[PDB]
Amino acid sequence: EKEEKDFRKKFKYDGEIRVLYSTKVTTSITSKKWGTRDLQVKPGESLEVIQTTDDTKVLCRNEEGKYGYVLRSYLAD
């Protein structure tokens, strides 16, 4: 949706978005920390995991038609 433009906007990343290994949000996930390029996901939830952004970063995707980033700091394996 129009949300894709929001993600692609900052995620000008040109790749093959495909949830290959959907990881589960660890209760120790980010619940307070929220960034413009971050997702408002909650700890203890499950979302689709895309490809690794840089080295230790997994981009989650929601059927909501919007994407979000997650730092390895607070995320599942």
UniProtKB/Swiss-Prot annotation:
Domain of life of the native organism: Eukaryota
All copies of domain SH3, residue ranges: 12-77
PTM comment, free text: T-cell receptor ligation leads to increased tyrosine phosphorylation.
Subcellular location: Cytoplasm; Nucleus; Cell junction
Known tissue expression: Expressed in hematopoietic tissues such as myeloid and T-cells, spleen and thymus. Not expressed in B-cells, nor in non-lymphoid tissues.
Summary of the function given for this chain in its UniProt record: Acts as an adapter protein of the FYN and LCP2 signaling cascades in T-cells. May play a role in linking T-cell signaling to remodeling of the actin cytoskeleton. Modulates the expression of IL2. Involved in platelet activation. Prevents the degradation of SKAP1 and SKAP2. May be involved in high affinity immunoglobulin epsilon receptor signaling in mast cells.
Quaternary assembly: Part of a complex consisting of SKAP2, FYB1 and PTPNS1. Part of a complex consisting of SKAP2, FYB1 and LILRB3. Part of a complex consisting of SKAP1, FYB1 and CLNK. Interacts with CLNK (via its SH2 domain); this interaction allows SKAP1 and FYB1 to recruit FYN to the complex, thus promoting the phosphorylation of CLNK by FYN. Interacts with FYN. Interacts with LCP2. Interacts with SKAP1. Interacts with SKAP2. Interacts with FASLG. Interacts with EVL. Interacts with TMEM47. Interacts with LCK.
Disease connection: Thrombocytopenia 3: A form of thrombocytopenia, a hematologic disorder defined by a decrease in the number of platelets in circulating blood, resulting in the potential for increased bleeding and decreased ability for clotting. THC3 is an autosomal recessive form characterized by onset in infancy.
The protein, known as: FYN-binding protein 1
Organism listed in the record: Homo sapiens (Human)
Residues represented out of the complete protein: 689 to 765 of 783
